[PDB]
Amino acid sequence: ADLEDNMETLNDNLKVIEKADNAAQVKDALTKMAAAAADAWSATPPKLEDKSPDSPEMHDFRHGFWILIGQIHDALHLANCGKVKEAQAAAEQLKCTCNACHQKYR
Amino acid sequence: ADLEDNMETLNDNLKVIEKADNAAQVKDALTKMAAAAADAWSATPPKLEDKSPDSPEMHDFRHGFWILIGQIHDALHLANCGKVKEAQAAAEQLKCTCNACHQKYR
Amino acid sequence: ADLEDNMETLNDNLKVIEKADNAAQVKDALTKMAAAAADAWSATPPKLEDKSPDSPEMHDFRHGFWILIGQIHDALHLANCGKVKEAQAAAEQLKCTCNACHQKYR
Amino acid sequence: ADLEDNMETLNDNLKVIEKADNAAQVKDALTKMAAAAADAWSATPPKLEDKSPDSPEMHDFRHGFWILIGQIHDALHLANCGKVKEAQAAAEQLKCTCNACHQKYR
Ligand code: HEM
Ligand code: HEM
Ligand code: HEM
Ligand code: HEM
Ligand SMILES: [Zn+2]
Ligand SMILES: [Zn+2]
Numbered sequence: 001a002d003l004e005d006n007m008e009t010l011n012d013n014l015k016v017i018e019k020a021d022n023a024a025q026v027k028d029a030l031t032k033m034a035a036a037a038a039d040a041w042s043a044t045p046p047k048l049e050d051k052s053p054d055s056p057e058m059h060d061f062r063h064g065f066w067i068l069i070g071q072i073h074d075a076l077h078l079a080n081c082g083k084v085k086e087a088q089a090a091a092e093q094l095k096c097t098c099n100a101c102h103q104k105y106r
Numbered sequence: 107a108d109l110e111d112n113m114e115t116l117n118d119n120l121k122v123i124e125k126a127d128n129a130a131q132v133k134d135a136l137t138k139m140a141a142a143a144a145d146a147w148s149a150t151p152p153k154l155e156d157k158s159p160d161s162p163e164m165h166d167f168r169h170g171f172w173i174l175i176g177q178i179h180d181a182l183h184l185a186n187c188g189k190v191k192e193a194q195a196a197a198e199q200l201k202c203t204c205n206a207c208h209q210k211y212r
Numbered sequence: 213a214d215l216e217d218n219m220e221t222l223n224d225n226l227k228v229i230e231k232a233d234n235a236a237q238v239k240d241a242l243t244k245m246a247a248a249a250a251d252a253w254s255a256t257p258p259k260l261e262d263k264s265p266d267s268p269e270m271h272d273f274r275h276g277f278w279i280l281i282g283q284i285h286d287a288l289h290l291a292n293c294g295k296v297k298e299a300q301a302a303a304e305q306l307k308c309t310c311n312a313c314h315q316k317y318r
Numbered sequence: 319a320d321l322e323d324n325m326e327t328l329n330d331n332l333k334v335i336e337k338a339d340n341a342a343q344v345k346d347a348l349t350k351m352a353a354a355a356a357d358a359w360s361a362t363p364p365k366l367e368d369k370s371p372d373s374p375e376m377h378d379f380r381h382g383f384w385i386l387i388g389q390i391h392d393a394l395h396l397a398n399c400g401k402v403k404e405a406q407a408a409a410e411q412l413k414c415t416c417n418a419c420h421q422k423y424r
């Protein structure tokens with residue numbers, strides 16, 4: 001899918017985690033977010049279209065998706081192990097990674 | 107994009123890194139390995155076909171691909187930084203993770 | 213050695229990184245922050261003096277220092293590899309981890 | 319707190335994990351290993367005494383302790399989650415990190 005379709009998946013599933021009742025709901029939404037981050041990684045965003053593929057800006061853009069996937073790995077351990085409130089708080093902290101990339105490149 | 111094809115991609119690229127001429131060749135092989143691990147994670151392997159998706163065996167099988175992806179993230183920092191011999195030594199340490207999964211599930 | 217002294221070291225070194233001109237200055241400040249977080253990990257804060265060491269609250273308090281030290285490991289690769297602006301932006305993103313612990317336990 | 323004393327602590331606690339009966343014994347041993355690896359990071363090993371503290375070899379030596387502590391972080395999630403057999407298998411995989419540093423620098 002294209003970059004804007006993957007951003008709608010990340011935004012919709014963050015809202016599902018905030019309102020979730022149980023572990024199965026939080027694990028399914030975190031899994032869908034990790035798949036959307038892995039697919040977004042191959043895109044070139046509109047503000048970087050004139051840059052080279054190997055530019056420092058394109059390295060920094062791709063790096064943000066590696067960081068988001070490592071944060072989701074840790075939150076999945078909490079959601080699978082009777083720490084669902086701690087996993088919901090971890091998902092709130094993902095917003096710092098979303099906002100950093102938007103401020104530079106959106 | 108079946109499990110056997112993803113395994114071929116992992117094995118061929120590990121060999122490219124061992125014999126590489128420069129940093130560009132190491133970075134391109136490590137990136138192909140990470141794409142194949144993200145694709146392999148969705149498979150149910152032949153020996154676990156009779157188990158639940160929520161079984162402790164299927165959680166441990168999926169977990170090995172998350173561990174491989176985090177090891178590749180660190181090796182990519184070394185390869186991009188003028189630390190090419192260090193990145194080739196890190197790629198040889200991935201074999202620990204490959205062998206642990208094979209002894210249990212292949 | 214006390215928790216308040218370690219917190220002053222973390223805050224002072226964030227300010228040094230924001231004002232830095234070169235890689236050596238950023239790497240030195242990040243290293244001092246990692247040593248202060250590793251010393252704070254064994255402390256008990258005033259609001260948790262009544263709790264078991266194996267309570268969920270004490271597990272979550274110690275977890276925040278494990279997360280902070282992993283974020284400093286990633287920023288140190290950027291600082292060593294000449295990516296000074298990218299290491300400064302990573303240090304600004306640490307504030308998310310500081311703010312989350314303080315809202316729960318300060 | 320010398321390098322040889324920290325190494326004895328790492329070796330004794332690794333052996334505890336292999337034949338442990340319960341989660342509490344595996345959590346206590348992993349925590350003792352993380353504190354010994356953090357204290358070892360400040361030492362200069364006899365074979366690197368004539369190198370600069372900023373040499374590529376001293377950066378690689380320090381990096382091995384950062385890698386070991388990230389591996390202990392993930393194994394502590396499994397030991398706290400009722401996944402004691404999975405934590406014992408993760409501890410077997412630490413051996414690849416111990417053996418890679420010894421082959422270079424011991
Ligand atoms: C969970 C974290 C994230 C959330 C919730 C999120 C959410 C969104 C939303 C709702 C949009 C607007 C889509 C529209 O036009 O309707 C968007 C766009 C965008 N995002 Fe994110 N995002 C996240 C992380 C990231 C990261 C980590 C990066 C970069 C590493 C990033 C880069 C972008 C860019 C470049 C656009 C603009 C796409 C365009 O205009 O074609 N986002 N995001
Ligand atoms: C870089 C590390 C790895 C390398 C080089 C590697 C290599 C291989 C090779 C060459 C095959 C034989 C494929 C064939 O039938 O032609 C294989 C099969 C397999 N591997 Fe891996 N592997 C790696 C990591 C893993 C990991 C981490 C897991 C589990 C988390 C895993 C699970 C399997 C399974 C289940 C099969 C058997 C598939 C079948 O019989 O259909 N592998 N791998
Ligand atoms: C780089 C991130 C951090 C910065 C800049 C920072 C800064 C500070 C500052 C300036 C204080 C006030 C010290 C005083 O009253 O004298 C403080 C207190 C405190 N911090 Fe942090 N902090 C950070 C991370 C954390 C983390 C990750 C945790 C928990 C995991 C934490 C737990 C606390 C607690 C519990 C206090 C209250 C101490 C007391 O009242 O005795 N801090 N911090
Ligand atoms: C859990 C992993 C590890 C175990 C079980 C382990 C165990 C040991 C043991 C039993 C010794 C013998 C000490 C003596 O002769 O008195 C030793 C020495 C040594 N180890 Fe480790 N070790 C581990 C990880 C590491 C790592 C990661 C590094 C480097 C990053 C390292 C570097 C050394 C060096 C340099 C010596 C020689 C010290 C001397 O001769 O003064 N070790 N280790
Ligand atoms: Zn964690
Ligand atoms: Zn590293």
Ligand SMILES: [Zn+2]
Binds near residue numbers: 063179
């Ligand atoms: Zn990174």
Ligand SMILES: [Zn+2]
Binds near residue numbers: 077
């Ligand atoms: Zn894990």
